[PDB]
Specification:
- Strands 2, 3, 4, 5, 6, 7, 9, 10, 11, 12, 13, 14 and 15 form a 13-stranded mixed beta sheet that branches.
- Helix content is 7%, strand content 29%.
- It has a single domain, classed as Carbonic Anhydrase II, CATH 3.10.200.10.
- It contains three helices and 15 strands.
- The protein is mainly β and 257 residues long.
- A hairpin with a 4-residue loop joins β4 and β5.
- Bound molecules: zinc ion.
- The site of zinc ion has 4 residues, from β7.
- Belongs to the alpha-carbonic anhydrase family.
- Its main location: cytoplasm.
- It is found in: Cytoplasm; Cell membrane.
- GO terms for molecular function: arylesterase activity; carbonate dehydratase activity; cyanamide hydratase activity; zinc ion binding.
Length: 257
């Protein structure tokens, strides 16, 4: 099956998932000099006050912190978006070293990790339906750099020992995703795809300009997770990022000058 190894990584995905070579794939390099300020973009609206987290799961390619998306409780709207998008889960991509890990890059710069807060368009009723639509998902992407600790991440870091291996889940209630946001909501936006198979081209990407800082100890604990199941040979869950894909016929817009 697909993964991030030598024999099943991103360069192989297209054999089972042809859309992975499509016209609007993600991530991309964000060339800050060619991105265009678009004064028509509205401010982003992140409304996470009533967010209800439920669970954290190691699914063999990352860990997802999952939310109750059965009501409008944690929603993204505004910016480039029409209508309302509900938070379903967040996860990260990270490296084996601090010098890599992000999926998007900024003038070719790779960050140590990248956070994806995944939201689906309520006009489609559920995530499964939404993910098949060209405007079905909105993903807020946030870069992580290593420096000072992010206090709001620590509760995530501390539960990772309980979900070391693929298929393990743990109760994870009352986690507040607002503690993962930077100060500024300035962003770049472009139309793209899931960055994991099936690579569906259903995503409005909203990538924040301001990274959050996490500590070396925090990211080190990400790197102790396993891609494998319990009782299978240990392979550390590191470098679970897809590299930048060709921009092709797209323009990245900036919300800021
Ligand atoms: Zn992701």
């Amino acid at each position: 099956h697909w993964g991030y190894g030598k024999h099943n990584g991103p360069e192989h995905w297209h054999k089972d998932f042809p859309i992975c070579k499509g016209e609007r794939q993600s991530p991309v390099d964000i060339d800050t000099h060619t991105a265009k300020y678009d004064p028509s973009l509205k401010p982003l609206s992140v409304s996470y006050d009533q967010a209800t987290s439920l669970r954290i799961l190691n699914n063999g390619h990352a860990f997802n912190v999952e939310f109750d998306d059965s009501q409008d409780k944690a929603v993204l709207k505004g910016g480039p978006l029409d209508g309302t998008y509900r938070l379903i889960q967040f996860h990260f991509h990270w490296g084996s070293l601090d010098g890599q890990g992000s999926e998007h890059t900024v003038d070719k710069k790779k960050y140590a990790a990248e956070l994806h807060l995944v939201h689906w368009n309520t006009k489609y009723g559920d995530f499964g339906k939404a993910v098949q639509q060209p405007d079905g998902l909105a993903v807020l992407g946030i870069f992580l750099k290593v420096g000072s600790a992010k206090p709001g991440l620590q509760k995530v870091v501390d539960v990772l020992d309980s979900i070391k291996t693929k298929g393990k889940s743990a109760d994870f209630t009352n986690f507040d995703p607002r503690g993962l946001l930077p100060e500024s909501l300035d962003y770049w936006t472009y139309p793209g795809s899931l960055t994991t198979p099936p690579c569906l081209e259903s995503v409005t990407w909203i990538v924040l300009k301001e990274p959050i800082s996490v500590s070396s100890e925090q990211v080190l604990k990400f790197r102790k997770l396993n891609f494998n199941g319990e009782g299978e040979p240990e392979e550390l869950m590191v470098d679970n990022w897809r590299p930048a894909q060709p921009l092709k016929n797209r323009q990245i817009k900036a919300s800021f000058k």
